[PDB]
Amino acid sequence: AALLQCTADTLADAVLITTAHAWQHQGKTLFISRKTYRIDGSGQMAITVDVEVASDTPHPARIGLNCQLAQVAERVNWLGLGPQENYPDRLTAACFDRWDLPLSDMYTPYVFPSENGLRCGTRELNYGPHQWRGDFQFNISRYSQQQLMETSHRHLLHAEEGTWLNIDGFHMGIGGDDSWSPSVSAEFQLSAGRYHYQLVWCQK
Amino acid sequence: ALTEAKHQQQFFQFRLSGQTIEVTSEYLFRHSDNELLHWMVALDGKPLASGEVPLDVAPQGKQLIELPELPQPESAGQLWLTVRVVQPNATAWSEAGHISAWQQWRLAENLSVTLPAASHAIPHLTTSEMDFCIELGNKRWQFNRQSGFLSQMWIGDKKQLLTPLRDQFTRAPLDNDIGVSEATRIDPNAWVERWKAAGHYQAEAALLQCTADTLADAVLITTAHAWQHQGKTLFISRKTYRIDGSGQMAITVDVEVASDTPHPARIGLNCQLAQVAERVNWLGLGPQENYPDRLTAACFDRWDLPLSDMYTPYVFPSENGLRCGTRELNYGPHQWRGDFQFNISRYSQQQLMETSHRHLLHAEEGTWLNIDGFHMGIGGDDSWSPSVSAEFQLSAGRYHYQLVWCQK
């Protein structure tokens, strides 16, 4: 990530900070991300994310915000498709309702570690004191994305300190018809080039 | 629509694989004896490479054609590979130089990490009870506080708009939208009747919030409107106009649509420009009109056409002359950037649907411009029933588009 622009201003009602990043590989820019965090007088932070993706590059698996929360709550309450994990390619079975599950249920123990426990169409996510609003996809877990791909078995996985949260506004379809060849459908892939999502981060 | 049929019925197919192009002949009996393949490579409509290849394809056969190594433009933008099949020699049914088949690809996009900000000057606003006023050098922007829409723009020693810039959720009903529905016979299934019952055409804008602030670099005004019919809100539109120190106005529009309501024909900004220029220059799919449902024939390039060409004279007046995938639109001094769909015309959307014939149409004062970030597919398989495909309809519920409005 290369910080090309970072500014901070105060509106009359709230404080607004505008930033813009760029991801570059061997001199070529892959993604350009522009964000405008707004800190309401109530404490609610509205993050507006506008992401541009190059056409030459293969489409990204997800367009997302991710962070590691130091707090580890026993329960996860969210309003969206559930209760089990679901993806854009596979969410017809999932039902929209207010769901409440333990943190362990939010993680699918596939023998071969990978991306798991994603809930789509979530309007509200309550984890501990934190709360996230807007329509997004999340897969809160104790294991980071970097740890899963490096790990070969599920028993080797160690619960990382705090909790890893991946709030992605857009996610690629998982597929698929077969394993040996790319089977993700065209419409499920993230090939728009430009993407936008806004989530309101607040406490309690 | 005839250029769409021509492109879909062309007797040469194309499958690009990196540098090499593959031409498959759909001819059953004749060999490509009089064919000439020409390919152009351009960024931002600017040709960087061109070449001619003698097309010598067998019937139902496929030919692999390698292109010379192409230049890599350091200037940011999107490269386009356009190939076309030209007939060098004349024929009994066609002139020499006739184009029979064409195809365009998208390759080697270069994102711009350049920083527009910031100019030495700084815009200035003056807040009053009546409205909002923003001044920068020769230019002055005014935002009406009663309605929430900007009422007037200024240059010089000069004037701009004839009608305030507002959100647009409807279009002039096409023959497909109308269907077999008449005044004597109401048809529930027709799109035009669903839109009438929902009250899209008669939806009034309600200014729920309007604020104005000044950032260090630029002036930012945030507004939010709502369209309500019989006590029910149909759309909620939130906008954050940003007036750069250079004079460039970046309009960020976020629109929410109810699920109960039938999906809007377009999500759009529209206004009436007092200026009437003879030519229209735009960068996008063209040169002829094209829609999300019908744009495969359209080719992306820098197009320049008279204002009359931008209007399609259908005998029965309706929505027409729309150009999709437009990155830049130059009309007179005005300029609009970002990816959008536009159909600049002399006739308003309200005039077209009320009019029954094309000869009754009178050119309204100034020029009507409809810049829509999203537009519904026109269809269709048949006229008498709704034939717009699901993916082409505007059914996401939430929509977002941002365009940069500047002068010169």
Curated annotation (Swiss-Prot), chain B:
Residues binding substrate, per UniProt: 384
Residues the record marks as site: Important for ensuring that an appropriate proportion of lactose is converted to allolactose: 384
Top-level taxonomic group: Bacteria
Transmembrane segments: none
Upregulating conditions: By allolactose.
Family statement: Belongs to the glycosyl hydrolase 2 family.
Assembly notes: Homotetramer.
Protein's name according to its UniProt entry: Beta-galactosidase
Stretch of the intact protein here: 617 to 1024 of 1024
